[PDB]
Swiss-Prot record:
Residues 203-319, 347-465 form the C-type lectin domain. Residues 1-120 form the Ricin B-type lectin domain. It is found in: Endosome membrane; Cell membrane. It comes from Homo sapiens (Human). Disulfide bonds join C13-C27, C52-C69, C146-C172, C160-C187, C225-C318, C294-C310, C369-C464, C441-C456. This is Macrophage mannose receptor 1. Glycans are attached at N82, N322. Coiled coil: none annotated. Mediates the endocytosis of glycoproteins by macrophages. Binds both sulfated and non-sulfated polysaccharide chains.
Length: 468
């Protein structure tokens, strides 16, 4: 994420010569003095010197030099303007080439070519590479973010290091003076041994990372997974729950997983957009108390789930990988010219119709769909859900049976027509109260056609979808 700062007009690059001299030289990508990187939302640090570029004051024609990095100093905060302009934050003054008299780099009112900078090698500005907090793994800092620069054995370190360690793992101090506070962690980056931080499941090849020594909020936890090209754990199959129950059987403190109700207009959902089709709540969850929108896996209570306040500082599980297990059935393709019986309307090779003639409990409804040559409808895309609520005479106060249910295995929803569950859109507060029955059927209700699970023993209208 390092870079050289490059001036196209001069075809030359910024070079740090001393804490009191920042100049330019020929663009040498192997010269550390010309290497720079963001270390916060607004500061840019010299890799060679571990000091941030700054100005003595927000005033015209002053020298830009290296200062001790400081998150509160208005005089080291930078931002990109126009495109290639790099300006001190809050004022129309700009990182400028200077002149052969100073040789130094200068702050200046002028927005010409001498004030316009892009990342060497690239054609995009400096804010394109940007800065992200980097949460540590294992270590004693409980997952705190790296602090750049940091002091280790009276030496300063610009990025993560394998110094003071013969195993070669990459670490960082989480306060600037590691020699004093002694707080560290391992960096979420590739190195020989990096992968032994993951448990790969031999059945599916999906990888899992159990961060039980950490205390992050839900949102912090999610960002630590995302920066590892992963995401918070989704639990989509009976097997996956079981593998994870095994992996955490020795733990007791809760661990964040990706299940949340943060979107207002809908209900429970996985942060990786997996369908929410396998349920494993602890008794008394999900609780309806309004602050508890993020879900934790409780390894000390058999790896069942509970929703908590998203600000609690727990451990977390990340999940990386695509499963090798093919599904048993794949949906059969459609037939682009589809003819439909009377009062049935096509979409994507299937005909649909809403029944409200006489309400039936879910089983009688499903029976009537099959006497008519189809089933209770399955839904696999938001496009398909939009078709149903738009083109079939659907009304916002409707409550209609669809094919989702867990009559085979409770807590595991399947489509009555046997197609895989690729997509779920739960109503706000749904699904709920599977603990109060043994069969969960699923209706479509509300202005948006979102789904609620309920008891199957209830007379309702229903939606049928025939075959191709």
């Amino acid at each position: 994420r390092q870079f050289l700062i490059y001036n196209e007009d001069h075809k030359r690059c910024v070079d740090a010569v001393s804490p009191s001299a920042v100049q330019t030289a020929a663009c040498n990508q192997d010269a550390e003095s010309q290497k720079f990187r963001w270390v916060s939302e607004s500061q840019i640090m010299s890799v060679a010197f571990k000091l941030c570029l700054g100005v003595p004051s927000k005033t015209d024609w002053v020298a830009i030099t290296l200062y001790a990095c400081d998150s509160k100093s208005e005089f080291q905060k930078w931002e990109c303007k126009n495109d290639t302009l790099l300006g001190i934050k809050g004022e129309d003054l700009f990182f400028n080439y200077g002149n052969r008299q100073e040789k130094n780099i200068m702050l200046y009112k002028g927005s010409g070519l001498w004030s316009r900078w892009k990342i060497y090698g690239t054609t995009d500005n400096l804010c394109s590479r940007g800065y992200e907090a980097m949460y540590t793994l294992l270590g004693n800092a409980n997952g705190a973010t790296c602090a750049f620069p940091f002091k280790f054995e009276n030496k300063w370190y610009a990025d993560c290091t394998s110094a003071g360690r013969s195993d070669g793992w990459l670490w960082c101090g989480t306060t600037t003076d590691y020699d004093t506070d002694k707080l560290f962690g391992y960096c979420p980056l590739k190195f020989e041994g990096s992968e032994s931080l993951w448990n790969k499941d031999p059945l599916t090849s999906v990888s899992y990372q159990i961060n039980s020594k950490s205390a992050l909020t839900w949102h912090q936890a999610r960002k630590s997974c995302q920066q590892q090209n992963a995401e918070l754990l989704s639990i989509t199959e009976i097997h996956e729950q079981t593998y994870l129950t095994g992996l955490t059987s020795s733990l007791t403190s809760g661990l964040w997983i990706g299940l949340n109700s943060l979107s207002f207009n809908s209900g429970w959902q996985w942060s990786d957009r997996s369908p929410f089709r396998y349920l494993n709540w602890l008794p008394g969850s999900p609780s309806a108390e309004p602050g508890k929108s993020c879900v934790s896996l409780n390894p000390g209570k058999n790896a069942k789930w509970e929703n908590l306040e998203c600000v609690q500082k727990l451990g977390y599980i990340c999940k990386k990988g695509n499963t090798t297990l093919n599904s048993f059935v794949i949906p059969s393709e459609s037939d682009v010219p589809t003819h439909c019986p009377s009062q049935w309307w096509p979409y994507a090779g299937h005909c649909y119709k809403i029944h409200r003639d006489e309400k039936k409990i879910q089983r009688d409804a499903l029976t009537t769909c099959r006497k008519e040559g189809g089933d209770l409808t399955s839904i696999h895309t938001i496009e398909e859900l939009d078709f149903i609520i738009s083109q079939l005479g659907y009304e916002p106060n409707d409550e209609l049976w669809i094919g989702l249910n867990d009559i085979k295995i409770q807590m595991y929803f399947e489509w009555s027509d046997g197609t895989p569950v690729t997509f779920t859109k739960w109503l706000r507060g749904e699904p709920s109260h599977e603990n109060n029955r043994q069969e969960d059927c699923v209706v479509m209700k509300g202005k948006d056609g979102y789904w609620a699970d309920r008891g199957c023993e209830w007379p309702l209208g229903y939606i049928c979808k025939m075959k191709s």
